[PDB]
Design a protein around this ligand. Structure first.
Ligand SMILES: [Mg+2]
Ligand SMILES: [Mg+2]
Lengths: 279, 273
């Protein structure tokens, strides 16, 4: 069987630690994640792939300086994907996720580094205070995914984890829930692609503040800290990094994934995003 | 699926290169290789496991050499499947140390690793070994001829029950301090010829043929082995008695040496009756 939905088989050799996966397009994280008519691997999937791969290769994880370079599109031909892990003497693990292109060449999709550090003691959020601060407008799930549909982003049942987005000033607070379609798979992932992708989806609220429609995908992430486990229902607090405003050539924001009580389970700092489509 | 009949899956981690295999006992190299009532992995299998493992770990050829191999413990597969592993440790001088072990299910205790085989490997060039004149060797080994029925009848009497897949001996020609054994892949397993480099049926048949030189028990050891070429459907095993060491040349129909083994040693036990 498979080691992990993103790690089908270990293919390590004397030179490199490596895992390999054949994505067909029938997996929920591809068939229900269609951007501009083509099934594309969610940005969140790469982080979970690197996390699981590191967990296997080692027998308090922090990612740093992650980049998303090229989308992994799965058309009529299955795609052979790989992740290689390079350990360094200082405890740092460099990962690279690529796929095999047919003419031999490797297509690079994501790079980054990881370190196993101690877990920081982040104080829990008062969700009541945040909800009041984000009372300018409330966006329903229908409103969010209607906007996405207009931008050419077709999210299937497994990737409609947004229940609603509470909009504030330079921040939004999004309520997330694992879709009932994929609850069976909750235990197969640490960072579930449905929840984590929904957290990144919720950055739409920052754009909806501007109202004027535009598609703004992330290309980089400065830091990610896994503090604890994810639950089926969570919250995403998204804030513009000081000095960053909506409409910038490169929009920078942070995302905190919190449990029902306001505990920070995953802290993401320094998303960088570029506008790729208007209206 | 499985990478190789002896390498089911790669399980390497940052610490070690590793492959793992769960043997059920239904495989031909276990059900047809019964010693003293137990299905046991043939000694020949360990070399093929190490060879296949090295081929995967290096990204795959010929010219491989094993040196200072030991066989310490038999891998018996009873009613419960057995979990086997091979770990490969590369060294700076180009040498690869391998260890083949299995997880023991000692109830009331915590699982422990049982070592079955150890050795080293090096990727070296192919030696230009002169072909043997099989006609001359057949003449030198004219003292006596043992048929297949005679050999495996003797084995059965000794408590060694070889099934169809491990009856590769067609006959043994007896000489002085040497024998020449005619080997053939049993038709039961000819389909699998391409799945192995060192096919366990042929290589085990070569080691079986050491019976011709007039009991041998574990631990075993091998000073050197050189893989020169591929194994064929029909082959010859030239066994020469060199302390308690003998050499085996696995040859094709024309006398070309495809596998050269030097310095097999096995513990000597008194023979009962
Ligand atoms: Mg590489
Ligand atoms: Mg080990």
């Amino acid at each position: 069987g498979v080691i992990h939905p993103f790690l089908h088989q270990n293919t390590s050799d004397f030179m490199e630690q490596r895992f390999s996966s054949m994505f067909t397009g029938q997996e929920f994280f591809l068939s229900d994640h269609v951007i501009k008519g083509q099934r594309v691997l969610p940005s969140a999937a790469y982080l979970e792939m690197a996390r699981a791969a590191i967990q296997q290769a080692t027998g308090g994880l922090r990612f740093k300086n992650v980049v998303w370079t090229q989308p992994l599109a799965v058309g009529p031909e299955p795609v052979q994907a790989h992740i290689e892990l390079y350990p360094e003497a200082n405890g740092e693990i460099v990962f690279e996720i690529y796929s095999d292109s047919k003419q031999t060449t490797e297509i690079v999709h994501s790079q980054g580094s990881a370190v196993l550090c101690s877990i920081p003691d982040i104080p829990s959020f008062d969700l009541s205070v945040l909800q009041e601060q984000c009372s300018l407008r409330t966006l329903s799930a229908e409103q969010c995914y209607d906007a996405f549909k207009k931008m050419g982003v077709d999210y299937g049942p497994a990737h409609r984890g947004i229940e609603q987005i509470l909009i504030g000033q330079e921040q939004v607070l999004a309520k997330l829930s694992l879709p009932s379609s994929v609850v069976k798979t909750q235990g197969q992932f640490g960072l579930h692609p449905s929840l984590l992708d929904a957290a990144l989806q919720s950055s739409l609220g920052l754009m909806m503040a501007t109202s004027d429609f535009s598609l703004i995908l992330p290309f980089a992430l400065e830091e990610m800290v896994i503090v604890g486990d994810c639950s089926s229902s969570m919250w995403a607090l998204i804030r513009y990094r000081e000095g960053s405003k909506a409409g910038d050539r490169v929009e920078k924001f942070d995302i905190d994934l919190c449990d029902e009580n306001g505990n920070v389970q995953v802290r993401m700092k320094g998303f960088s995003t570029r506008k790729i489509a208007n209206v």
